[PDB]
Coordinates of C-alpha atoms and ligand atoms in Angstrom, one line a residue:
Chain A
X1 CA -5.9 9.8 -37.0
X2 CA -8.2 11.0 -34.1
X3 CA -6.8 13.0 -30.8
X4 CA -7.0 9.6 -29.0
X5 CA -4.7 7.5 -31.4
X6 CA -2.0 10.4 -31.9
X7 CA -1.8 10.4 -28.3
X8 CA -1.1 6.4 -27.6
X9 CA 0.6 6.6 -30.6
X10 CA 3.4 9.3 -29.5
X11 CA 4.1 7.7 -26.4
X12 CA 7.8 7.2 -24.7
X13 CA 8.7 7.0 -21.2
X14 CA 10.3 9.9 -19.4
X15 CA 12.6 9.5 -16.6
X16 CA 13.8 13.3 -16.2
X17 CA 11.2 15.4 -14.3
X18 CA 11.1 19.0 -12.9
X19 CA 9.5 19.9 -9.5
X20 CA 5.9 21.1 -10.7
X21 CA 3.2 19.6 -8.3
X22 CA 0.9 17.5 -10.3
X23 CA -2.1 19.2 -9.7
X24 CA -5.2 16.9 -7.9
X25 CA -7.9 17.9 -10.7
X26 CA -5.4 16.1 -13.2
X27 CA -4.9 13.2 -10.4
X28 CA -8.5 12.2 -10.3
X29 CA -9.0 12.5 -14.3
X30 CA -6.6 9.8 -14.6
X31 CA -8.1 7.8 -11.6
X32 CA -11.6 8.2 -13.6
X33 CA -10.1 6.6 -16.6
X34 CA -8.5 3.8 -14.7
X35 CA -11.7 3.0 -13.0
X36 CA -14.1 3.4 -16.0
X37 CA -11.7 0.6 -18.0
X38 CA -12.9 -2.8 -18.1
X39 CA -12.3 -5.7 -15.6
X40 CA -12.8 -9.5 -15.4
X41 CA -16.6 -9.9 -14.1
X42 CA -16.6 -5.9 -12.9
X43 CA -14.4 -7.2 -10.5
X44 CA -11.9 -4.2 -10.4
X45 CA -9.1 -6.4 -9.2
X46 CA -7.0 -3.7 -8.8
X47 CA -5.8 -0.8 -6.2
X48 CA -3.9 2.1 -6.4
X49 CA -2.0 3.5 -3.8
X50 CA -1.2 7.6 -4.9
X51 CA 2.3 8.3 -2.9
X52 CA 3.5 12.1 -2.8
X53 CA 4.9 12.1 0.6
X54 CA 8.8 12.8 0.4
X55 CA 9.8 10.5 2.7
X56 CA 8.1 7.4 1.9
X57 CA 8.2 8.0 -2.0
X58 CA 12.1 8.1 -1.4
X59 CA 12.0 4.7 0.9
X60 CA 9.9 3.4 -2.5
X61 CA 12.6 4.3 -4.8
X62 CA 15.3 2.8 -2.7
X63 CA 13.4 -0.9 -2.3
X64 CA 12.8 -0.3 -6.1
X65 CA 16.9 -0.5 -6.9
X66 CA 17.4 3.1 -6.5
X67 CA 15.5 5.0 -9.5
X68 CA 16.6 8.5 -9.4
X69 CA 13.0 9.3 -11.4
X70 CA 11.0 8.2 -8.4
X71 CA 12.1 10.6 -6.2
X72 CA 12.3 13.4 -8.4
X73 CA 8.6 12.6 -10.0
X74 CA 5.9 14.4 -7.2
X75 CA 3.7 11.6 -8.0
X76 CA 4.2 7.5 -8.0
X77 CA 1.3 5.2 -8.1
X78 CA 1.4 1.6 -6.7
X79 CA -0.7 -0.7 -8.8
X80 CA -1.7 -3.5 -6.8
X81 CA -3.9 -6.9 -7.9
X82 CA -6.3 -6.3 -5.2
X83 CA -8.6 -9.5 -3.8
X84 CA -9.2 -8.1 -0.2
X85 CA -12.5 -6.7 -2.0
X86 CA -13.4 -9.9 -2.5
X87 CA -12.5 -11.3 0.5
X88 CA -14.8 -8.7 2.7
X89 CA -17.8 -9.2 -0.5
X90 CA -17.2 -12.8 0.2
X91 CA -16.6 -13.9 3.8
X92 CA -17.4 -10.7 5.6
X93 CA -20.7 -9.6 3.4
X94 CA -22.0 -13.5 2.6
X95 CA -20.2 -16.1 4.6
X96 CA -18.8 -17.9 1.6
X97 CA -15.0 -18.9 1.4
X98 CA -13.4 -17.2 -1.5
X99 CA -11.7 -20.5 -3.1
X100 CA -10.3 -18.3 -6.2
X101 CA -7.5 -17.3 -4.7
X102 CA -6.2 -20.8 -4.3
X103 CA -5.3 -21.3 -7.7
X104 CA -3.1 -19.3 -10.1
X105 CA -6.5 -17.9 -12.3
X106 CA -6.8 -15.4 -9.5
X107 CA -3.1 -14.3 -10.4
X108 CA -4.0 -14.4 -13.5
X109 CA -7.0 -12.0 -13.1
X110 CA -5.5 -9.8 -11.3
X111 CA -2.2 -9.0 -13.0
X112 CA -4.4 -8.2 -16.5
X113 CA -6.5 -6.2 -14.4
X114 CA -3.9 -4.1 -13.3
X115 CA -2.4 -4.5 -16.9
X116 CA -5.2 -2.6 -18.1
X117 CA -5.4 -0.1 -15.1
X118 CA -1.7 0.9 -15.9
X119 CA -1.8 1.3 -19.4
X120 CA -5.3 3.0 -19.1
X121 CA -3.4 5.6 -16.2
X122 CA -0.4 6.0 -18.9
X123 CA -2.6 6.9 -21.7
X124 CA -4.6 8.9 -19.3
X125 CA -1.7 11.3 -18.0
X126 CA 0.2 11.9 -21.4
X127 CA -2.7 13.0 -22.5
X128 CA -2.6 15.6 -20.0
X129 CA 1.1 16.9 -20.8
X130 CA 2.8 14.7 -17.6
X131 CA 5.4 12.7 -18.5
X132 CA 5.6 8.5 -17.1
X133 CA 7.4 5.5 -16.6
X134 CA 6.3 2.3 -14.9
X135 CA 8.8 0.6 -12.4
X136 CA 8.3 -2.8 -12.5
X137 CA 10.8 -3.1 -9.7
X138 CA 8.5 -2.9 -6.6
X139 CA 8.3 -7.1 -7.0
X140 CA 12.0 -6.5 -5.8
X141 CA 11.4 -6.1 -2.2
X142 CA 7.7 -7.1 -2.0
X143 CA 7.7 -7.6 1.6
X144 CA 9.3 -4.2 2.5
X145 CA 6.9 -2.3 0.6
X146 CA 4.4 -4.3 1.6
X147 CA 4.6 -3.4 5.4
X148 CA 5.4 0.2 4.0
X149 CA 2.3 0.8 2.6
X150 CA 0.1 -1.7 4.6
X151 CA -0.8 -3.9 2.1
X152 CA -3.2 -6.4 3.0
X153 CA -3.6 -10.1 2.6
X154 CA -4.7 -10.6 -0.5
X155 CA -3.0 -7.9 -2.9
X156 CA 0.3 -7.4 -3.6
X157 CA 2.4 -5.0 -5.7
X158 CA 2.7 -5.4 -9.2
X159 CA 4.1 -2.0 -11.0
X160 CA 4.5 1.2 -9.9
X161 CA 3.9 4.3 -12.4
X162 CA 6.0 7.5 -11.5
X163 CA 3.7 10.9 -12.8
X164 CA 5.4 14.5 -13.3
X165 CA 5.7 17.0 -15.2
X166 CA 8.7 16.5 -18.4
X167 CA 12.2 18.1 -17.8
X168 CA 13.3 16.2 -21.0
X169 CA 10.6 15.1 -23.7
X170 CA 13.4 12.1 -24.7
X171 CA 12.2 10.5 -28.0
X172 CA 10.4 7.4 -29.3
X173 CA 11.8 3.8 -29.1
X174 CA 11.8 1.3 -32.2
X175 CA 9.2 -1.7 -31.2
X176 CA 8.9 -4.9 -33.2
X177 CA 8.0 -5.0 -36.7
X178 CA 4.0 -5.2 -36.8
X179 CA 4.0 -8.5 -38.3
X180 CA 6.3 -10.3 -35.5
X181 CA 3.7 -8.9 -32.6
X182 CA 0.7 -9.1 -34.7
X183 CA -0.3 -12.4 -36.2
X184 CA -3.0 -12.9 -38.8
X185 CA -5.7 -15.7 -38.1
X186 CA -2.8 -17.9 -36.9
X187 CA 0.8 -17.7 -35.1
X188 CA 3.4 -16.8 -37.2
X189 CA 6.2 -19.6 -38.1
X190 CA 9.0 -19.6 -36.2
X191 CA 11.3 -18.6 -39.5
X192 CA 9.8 -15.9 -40.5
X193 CA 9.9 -14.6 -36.8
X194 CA 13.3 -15.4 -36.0
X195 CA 13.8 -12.8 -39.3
X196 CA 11.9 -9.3 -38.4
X197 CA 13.7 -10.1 -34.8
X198 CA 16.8 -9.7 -36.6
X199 CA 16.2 -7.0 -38.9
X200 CA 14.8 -5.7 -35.7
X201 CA 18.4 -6.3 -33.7
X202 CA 19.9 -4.2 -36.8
X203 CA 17.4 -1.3 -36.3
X204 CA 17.7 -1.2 -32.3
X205 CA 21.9 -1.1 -32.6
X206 CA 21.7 1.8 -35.3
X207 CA 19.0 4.0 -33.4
X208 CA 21.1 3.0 -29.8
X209 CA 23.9 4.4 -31.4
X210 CA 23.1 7.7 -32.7
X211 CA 20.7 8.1 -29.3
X212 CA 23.8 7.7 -27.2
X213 CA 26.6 9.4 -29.8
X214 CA 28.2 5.8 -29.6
X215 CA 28.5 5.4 -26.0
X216 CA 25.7 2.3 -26.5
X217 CA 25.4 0.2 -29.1
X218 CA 23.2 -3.1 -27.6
X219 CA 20.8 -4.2 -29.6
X220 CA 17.5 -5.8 -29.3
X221 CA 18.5 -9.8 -28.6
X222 CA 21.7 -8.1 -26.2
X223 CA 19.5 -6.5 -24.3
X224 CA 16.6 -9.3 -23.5
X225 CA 19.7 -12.2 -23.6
X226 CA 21.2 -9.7 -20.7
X227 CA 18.2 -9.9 -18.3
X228 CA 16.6 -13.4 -18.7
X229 CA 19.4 -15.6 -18.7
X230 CA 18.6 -15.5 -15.1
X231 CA 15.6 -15.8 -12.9
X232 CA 16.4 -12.6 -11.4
X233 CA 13.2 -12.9 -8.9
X234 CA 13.2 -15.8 -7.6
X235 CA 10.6 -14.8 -4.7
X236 CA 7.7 -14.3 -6.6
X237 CA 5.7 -17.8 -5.4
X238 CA 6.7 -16.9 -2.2
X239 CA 5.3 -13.3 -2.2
X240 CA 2.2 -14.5 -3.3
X241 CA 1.7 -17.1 -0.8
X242 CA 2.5 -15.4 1.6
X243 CA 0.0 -12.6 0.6
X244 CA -2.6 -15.7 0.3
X245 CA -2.5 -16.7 -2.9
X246 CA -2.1 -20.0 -3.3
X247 CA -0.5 -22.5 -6.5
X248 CA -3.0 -25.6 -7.4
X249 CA -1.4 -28.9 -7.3
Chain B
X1 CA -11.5 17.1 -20.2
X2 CA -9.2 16.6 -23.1
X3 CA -10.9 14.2 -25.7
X4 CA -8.6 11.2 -25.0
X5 CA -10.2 11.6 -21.2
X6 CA -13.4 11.7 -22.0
X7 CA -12.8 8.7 -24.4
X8 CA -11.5 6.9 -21.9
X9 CA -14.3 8.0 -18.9
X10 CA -17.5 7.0 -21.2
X11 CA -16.3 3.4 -21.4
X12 CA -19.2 0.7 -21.4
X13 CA -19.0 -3.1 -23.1
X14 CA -20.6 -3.9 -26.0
X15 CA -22.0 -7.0 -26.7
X16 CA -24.4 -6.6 -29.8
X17 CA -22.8 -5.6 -32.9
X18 CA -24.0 -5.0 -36.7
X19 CA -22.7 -7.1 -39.4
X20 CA -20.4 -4.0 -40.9
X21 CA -16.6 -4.8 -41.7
X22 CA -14.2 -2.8 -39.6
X23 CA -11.3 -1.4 -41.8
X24 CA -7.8 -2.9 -41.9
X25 CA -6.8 1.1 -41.8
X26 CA -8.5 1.3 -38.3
X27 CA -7.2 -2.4 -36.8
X28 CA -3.8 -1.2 -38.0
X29 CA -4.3 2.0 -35.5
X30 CA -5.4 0.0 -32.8
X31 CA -2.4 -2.3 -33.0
X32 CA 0.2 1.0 -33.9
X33 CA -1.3 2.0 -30.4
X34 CA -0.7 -1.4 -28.7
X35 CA 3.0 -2.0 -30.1
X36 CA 3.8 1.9 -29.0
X37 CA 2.5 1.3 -25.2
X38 CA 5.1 0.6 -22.2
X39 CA 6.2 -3.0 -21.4
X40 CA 8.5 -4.1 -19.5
X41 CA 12.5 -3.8 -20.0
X42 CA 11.1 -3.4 -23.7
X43 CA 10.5 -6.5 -23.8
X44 CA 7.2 -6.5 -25.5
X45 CA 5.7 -10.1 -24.3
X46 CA 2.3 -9.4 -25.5
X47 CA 1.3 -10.9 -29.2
X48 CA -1.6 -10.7 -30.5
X49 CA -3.8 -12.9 -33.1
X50 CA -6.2 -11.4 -35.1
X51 CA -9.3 -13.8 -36.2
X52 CA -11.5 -12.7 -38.9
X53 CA -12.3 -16.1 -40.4
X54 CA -16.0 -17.5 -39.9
X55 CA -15.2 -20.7 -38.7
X56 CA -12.3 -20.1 -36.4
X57 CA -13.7 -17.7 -35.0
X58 CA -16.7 -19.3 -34.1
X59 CA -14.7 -22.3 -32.7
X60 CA -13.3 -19.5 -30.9
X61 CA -16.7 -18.9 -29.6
X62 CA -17.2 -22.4 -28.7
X63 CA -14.1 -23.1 -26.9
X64 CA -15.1 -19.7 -24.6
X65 CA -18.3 -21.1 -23.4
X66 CA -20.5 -19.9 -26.5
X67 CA -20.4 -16.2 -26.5
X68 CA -23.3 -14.9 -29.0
X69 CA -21.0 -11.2 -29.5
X70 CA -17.7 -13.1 -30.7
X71 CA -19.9 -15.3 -33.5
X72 CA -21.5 -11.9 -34.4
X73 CA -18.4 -9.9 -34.2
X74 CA -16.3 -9.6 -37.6
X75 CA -13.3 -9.2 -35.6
X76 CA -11.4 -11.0 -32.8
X77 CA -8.4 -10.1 -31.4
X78 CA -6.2 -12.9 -28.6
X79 CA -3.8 -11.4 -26.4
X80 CA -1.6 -13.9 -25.2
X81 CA 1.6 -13.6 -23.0
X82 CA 4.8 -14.2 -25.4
X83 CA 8.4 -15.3 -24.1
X84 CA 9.0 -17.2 -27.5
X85 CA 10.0 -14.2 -29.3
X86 CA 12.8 -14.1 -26.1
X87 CA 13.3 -17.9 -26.5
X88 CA 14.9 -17.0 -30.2
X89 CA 16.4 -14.1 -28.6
X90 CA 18.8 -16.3 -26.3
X91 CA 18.7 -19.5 -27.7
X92 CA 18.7 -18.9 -31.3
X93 CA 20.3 -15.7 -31.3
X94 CA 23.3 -15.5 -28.5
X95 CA 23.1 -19.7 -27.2
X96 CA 21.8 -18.4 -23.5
X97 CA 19.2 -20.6 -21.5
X98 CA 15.8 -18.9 -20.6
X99 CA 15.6 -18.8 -16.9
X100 CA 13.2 -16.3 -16.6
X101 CA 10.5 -18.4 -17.6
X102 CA 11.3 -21.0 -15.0
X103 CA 9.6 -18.0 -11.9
X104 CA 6.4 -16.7 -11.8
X105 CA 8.0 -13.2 -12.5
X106 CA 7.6 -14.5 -16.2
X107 CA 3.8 -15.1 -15.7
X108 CA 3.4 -11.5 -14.0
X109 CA 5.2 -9.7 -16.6
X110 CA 3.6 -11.4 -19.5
X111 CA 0.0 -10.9 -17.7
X112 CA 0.9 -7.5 -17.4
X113 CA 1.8 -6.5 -20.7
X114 CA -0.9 -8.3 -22.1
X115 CA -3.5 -6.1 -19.6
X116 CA -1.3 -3.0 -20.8
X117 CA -1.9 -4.3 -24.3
X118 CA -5.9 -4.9 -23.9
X119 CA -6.4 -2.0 -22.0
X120 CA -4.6 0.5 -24.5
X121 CA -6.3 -1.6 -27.6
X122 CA -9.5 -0.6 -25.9
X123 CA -9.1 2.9 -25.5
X124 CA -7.9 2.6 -29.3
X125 CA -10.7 1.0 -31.0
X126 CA -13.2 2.7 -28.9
X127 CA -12.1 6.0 -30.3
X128 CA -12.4 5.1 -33.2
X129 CA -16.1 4.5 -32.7
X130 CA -15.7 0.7 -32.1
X131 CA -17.8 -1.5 -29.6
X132 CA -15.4 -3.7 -27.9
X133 CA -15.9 -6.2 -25.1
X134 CA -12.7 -8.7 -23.9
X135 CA -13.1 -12.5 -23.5
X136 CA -11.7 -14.1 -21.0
X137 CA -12.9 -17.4 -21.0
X138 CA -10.0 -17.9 -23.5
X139 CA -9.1 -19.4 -20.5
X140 CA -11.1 -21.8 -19.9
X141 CA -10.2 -24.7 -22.8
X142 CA -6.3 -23.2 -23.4
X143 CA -5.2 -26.4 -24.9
X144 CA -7.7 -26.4 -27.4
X145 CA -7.4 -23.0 -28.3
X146 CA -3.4 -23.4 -28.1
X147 CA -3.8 -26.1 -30.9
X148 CA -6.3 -24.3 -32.9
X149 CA -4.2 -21.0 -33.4
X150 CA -0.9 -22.7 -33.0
X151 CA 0.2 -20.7 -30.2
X152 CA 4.4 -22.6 -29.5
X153 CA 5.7 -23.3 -26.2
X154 CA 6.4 -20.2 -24.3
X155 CA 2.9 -18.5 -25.8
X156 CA 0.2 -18.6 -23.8
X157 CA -3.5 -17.2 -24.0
X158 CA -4.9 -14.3 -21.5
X159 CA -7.6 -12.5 -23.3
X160 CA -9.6 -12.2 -26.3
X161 CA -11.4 -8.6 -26.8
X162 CA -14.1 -8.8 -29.3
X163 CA -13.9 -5.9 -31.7
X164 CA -17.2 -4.5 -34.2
X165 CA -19.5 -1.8 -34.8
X166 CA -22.2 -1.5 -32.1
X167 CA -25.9 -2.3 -32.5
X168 CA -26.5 -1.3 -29.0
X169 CA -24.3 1.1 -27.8
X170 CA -25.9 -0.2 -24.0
X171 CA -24.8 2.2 -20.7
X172 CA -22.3 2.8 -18.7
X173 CA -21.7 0.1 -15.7
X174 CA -21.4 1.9 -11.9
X175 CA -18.1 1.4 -10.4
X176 CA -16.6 1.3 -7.1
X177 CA -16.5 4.6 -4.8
X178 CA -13.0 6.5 -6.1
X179 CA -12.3 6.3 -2.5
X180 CA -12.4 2.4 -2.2
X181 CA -10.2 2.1 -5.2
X182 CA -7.7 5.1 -4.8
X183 CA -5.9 4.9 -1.4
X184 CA -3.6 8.0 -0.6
X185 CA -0.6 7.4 0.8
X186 CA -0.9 3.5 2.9
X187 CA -3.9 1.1 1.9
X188 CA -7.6 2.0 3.6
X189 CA -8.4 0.5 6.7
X190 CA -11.0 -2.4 6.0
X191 CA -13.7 -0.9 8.3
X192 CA -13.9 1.6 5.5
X193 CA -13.4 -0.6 3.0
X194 CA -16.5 -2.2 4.2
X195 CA -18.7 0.3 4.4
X196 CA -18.0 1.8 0.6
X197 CA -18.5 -2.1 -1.0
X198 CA -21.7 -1.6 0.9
X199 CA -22.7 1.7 -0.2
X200 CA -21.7 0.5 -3.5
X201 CA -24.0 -3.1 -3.3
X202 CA -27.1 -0.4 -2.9
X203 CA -25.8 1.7 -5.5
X204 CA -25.8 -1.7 -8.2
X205 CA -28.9 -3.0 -6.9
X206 CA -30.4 -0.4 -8.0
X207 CA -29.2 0.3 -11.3
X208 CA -29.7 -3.5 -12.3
X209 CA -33.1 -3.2 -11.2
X210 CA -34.0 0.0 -13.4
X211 CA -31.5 -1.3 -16.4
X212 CA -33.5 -4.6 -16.2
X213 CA -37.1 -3.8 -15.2
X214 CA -36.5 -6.1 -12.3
X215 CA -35.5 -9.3 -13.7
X216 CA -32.4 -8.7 -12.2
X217 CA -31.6 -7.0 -8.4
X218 CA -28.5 -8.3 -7.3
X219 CA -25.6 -6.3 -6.1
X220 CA -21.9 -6.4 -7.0
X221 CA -20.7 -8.2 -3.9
X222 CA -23.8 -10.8 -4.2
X223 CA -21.9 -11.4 -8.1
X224 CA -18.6 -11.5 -6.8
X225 CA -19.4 -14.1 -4.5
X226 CA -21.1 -16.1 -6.9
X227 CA -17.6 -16.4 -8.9
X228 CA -15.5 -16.9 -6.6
X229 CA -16.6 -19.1 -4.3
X230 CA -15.2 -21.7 -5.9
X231 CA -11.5 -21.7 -8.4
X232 CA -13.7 -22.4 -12.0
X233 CA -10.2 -22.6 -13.8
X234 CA -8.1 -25.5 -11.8
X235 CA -6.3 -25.9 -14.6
X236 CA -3.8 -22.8 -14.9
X237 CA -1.0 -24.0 -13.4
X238 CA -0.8 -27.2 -16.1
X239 CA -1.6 -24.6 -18.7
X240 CA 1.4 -22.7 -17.6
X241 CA 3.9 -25.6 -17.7
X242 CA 2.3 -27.4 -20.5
X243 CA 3.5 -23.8 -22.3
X244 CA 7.2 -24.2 -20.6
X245 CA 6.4 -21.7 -17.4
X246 CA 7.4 -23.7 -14.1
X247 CA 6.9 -22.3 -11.3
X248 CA 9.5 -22.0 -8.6
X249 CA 10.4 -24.3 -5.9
Ligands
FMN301 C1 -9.8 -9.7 -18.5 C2 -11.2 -9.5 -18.8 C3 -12.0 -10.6 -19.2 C4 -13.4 -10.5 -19.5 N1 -14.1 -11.6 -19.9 C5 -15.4 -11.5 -20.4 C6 -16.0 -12.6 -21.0 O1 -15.5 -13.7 -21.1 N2 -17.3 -12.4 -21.5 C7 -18.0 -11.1 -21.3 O2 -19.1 -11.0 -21.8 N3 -17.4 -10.1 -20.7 C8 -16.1 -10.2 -20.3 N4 -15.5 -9.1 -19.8 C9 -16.2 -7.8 -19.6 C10 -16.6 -7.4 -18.1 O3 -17.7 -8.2 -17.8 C11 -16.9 -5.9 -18.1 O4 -15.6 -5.2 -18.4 C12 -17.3 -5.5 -16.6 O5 -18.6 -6.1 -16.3 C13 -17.4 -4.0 -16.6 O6 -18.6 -3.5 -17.5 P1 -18.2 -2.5 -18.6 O7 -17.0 -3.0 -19.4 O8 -19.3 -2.5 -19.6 O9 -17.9 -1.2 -18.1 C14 -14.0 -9.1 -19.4 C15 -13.3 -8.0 -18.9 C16 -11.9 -8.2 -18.7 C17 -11.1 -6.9 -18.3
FMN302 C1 5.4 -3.4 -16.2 C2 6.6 -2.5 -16.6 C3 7.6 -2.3 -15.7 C4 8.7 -1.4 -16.0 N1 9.7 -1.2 -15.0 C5 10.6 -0.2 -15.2 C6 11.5 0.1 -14.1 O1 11.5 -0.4 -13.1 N2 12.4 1.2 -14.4 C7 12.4 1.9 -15.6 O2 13.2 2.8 -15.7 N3 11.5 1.6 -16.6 C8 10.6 0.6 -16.4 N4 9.7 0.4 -17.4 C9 9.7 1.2 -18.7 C10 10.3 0.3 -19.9 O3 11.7 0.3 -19.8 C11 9.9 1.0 -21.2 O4 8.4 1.0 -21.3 C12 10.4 0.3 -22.5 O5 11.9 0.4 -22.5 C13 9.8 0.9 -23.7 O6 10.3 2.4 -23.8 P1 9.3 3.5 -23.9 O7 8.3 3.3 -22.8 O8 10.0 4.8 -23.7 O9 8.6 3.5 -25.1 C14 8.6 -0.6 -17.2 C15 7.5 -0.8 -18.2 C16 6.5 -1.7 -17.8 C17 5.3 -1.9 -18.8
CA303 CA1 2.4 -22.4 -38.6
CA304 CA1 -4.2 1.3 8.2
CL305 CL1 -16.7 -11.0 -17.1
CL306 CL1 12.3 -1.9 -17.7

């Protein structure tokens, strides 16, 4: 196993940091990597706003529920799909009407392409010794941190990704057995599936249990069952509409 | 530069490959790498098909507009955004409806851990000495596809990423100024904006013209625009609820 592959390999979110500065030289590395990654048609869909100002990292962490990690972190990036590019290459550069937008395949485009910019900056800064966690939480108060950060029409926030150095290492999380999330040549029967998800349930509890001394014992099923019994943002369509994306009919 | 850095930074597509087998061992890497990357709330909503067979895969092939490099390729890999593994998780498992899937917060976080997924398979295989190039005119005949690799409601396809030993290791692709794609601390002003996408247009001119003798001069924004100008895949949103994903009201 190769430098590269022990590295994405050993991964596990940290969300206890100490007050080192991230130092800029590291900064741009992982800005390199994010940018050399691929993207639909070169497009590079995707912008990232680097926050390290006090104050307006702390308004962030409050629109994003209150994530203690945020604040303490020196660094948080805002990964945003980003089709303002295309709006200036289009109308401003070539007097064409960007119709993409007006149909969910520019949603589409833009969340893989910030996908890929994310996991690219994650693998990126663990190599580097800095800890991460992504906060998925900034679609919470879109419109807040929106006018925060002067987002444009055309992009809107997707994740964040808080970047520090490690106060506590934590430790690696169970994921899926292999064969549920990889399927050979065709999708695995539903049987079979509903099976490593339960052998996977039995795994989760133990390891929850002697992570917490006992204090948590939630399993897999518990946990997903707890969050998506509800829509819990409902304002997503609205978000993007409003940032001019448009649903087909 | 650490060597999972300058992995990542000497990124390039590949789309001629040999006819040489990749290894199980290595494929089992690149997906130990994808499984151990973030997603969100754990939720791991990325699955991902492996196609090795001849024929599917070159139906594959067909249904994404006849791509020579995925008929060539010995390997195939579809990332599609997964909510059925949570539709056994409440339904089957603790008799809770899904509501999440009834928002477009469902879409966003499957597209993004699906990009997190391709993106960290990328870096993966390319360490290991891999070409790779992803495919995502997946899609642009989804139902066809759907049927072919038995994807179940809930499932639906974002990406392919061709995987193979290169036969042409081709050259790296210029990108955006770091400047028009890293913002510090609110999102540049579009006057700026401007002017880097036109630095950049001379900058890509240039290199097509020298990378292709001069059969090909145009610039990025000249590409863009020849994309987007109109939305090639109308057909998302049925995709989307064809699969069980309904967008909100
Ligand atoms: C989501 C996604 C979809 C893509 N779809 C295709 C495709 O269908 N066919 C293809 O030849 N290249 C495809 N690509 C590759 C892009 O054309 C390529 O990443 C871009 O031009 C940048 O060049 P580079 O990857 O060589 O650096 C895709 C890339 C991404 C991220
Ligand atoms: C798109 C996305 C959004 C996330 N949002 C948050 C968040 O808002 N707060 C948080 O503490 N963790 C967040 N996470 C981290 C996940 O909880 C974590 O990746 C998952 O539990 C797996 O644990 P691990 O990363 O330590 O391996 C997010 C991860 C992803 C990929
Ligand atoms: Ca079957
Ligand atoms: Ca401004
Ligand atoms: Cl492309
Ligand atoms: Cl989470």
């Amino acid at each position: 196993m190769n430098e590269v592959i022990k590295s994405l390999t050993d991964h596990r979110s940290i969300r206890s940091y100490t007050d080192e500065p991230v130092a800029q030289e590291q900064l741009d590395q992982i800005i390199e990597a994010v940018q050399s990654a691929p993207s639909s048609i070169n497009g590079q869909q995707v912008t990232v706003i680097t926050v390290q100002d006090k104050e307006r990292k702390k308004k962030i962490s409050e629109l994003a529920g209150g994530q203690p990690w945020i604040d303490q972190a020196p660094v948080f990036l805002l990964f945003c799909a980003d089709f303002n590019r295309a709006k200036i290459a289009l109308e401003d550069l070539h007097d064409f009407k960007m119709e993409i937008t007006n149909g969910l395949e520019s949603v589409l485009v833009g969340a893989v392409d910030a996908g890929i910019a994310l996991g690219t900056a994650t693998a990126a800064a663990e190599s580097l010794g800095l800890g991460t966690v992504p906060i998925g939480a900034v679609r919470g108060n879109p419109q807040e941190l929106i006018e925060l950060l002067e987002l444009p029409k055309y992009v809107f926030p997707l994740s964040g990704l808080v970047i520090g150095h490690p106060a506590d290492r934590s430790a690696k999380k169970p994921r899926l057995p292999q064969e549920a999330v990889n399927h050979q040549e065709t999708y695995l029967n539903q049987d079979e599936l509903t099976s490593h998800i339960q052998a996977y349930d039995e795994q989760m509890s133990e390891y929850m249990n002697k992570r917490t001394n006992g204090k948590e014992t939630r399993n897999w099923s518990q946990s997903i069952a707890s969050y998506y019994e509800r829509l819990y943002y409902p304002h997503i369509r609205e978000m993007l509409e409003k940032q001019g994306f448009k649903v087909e009919k």
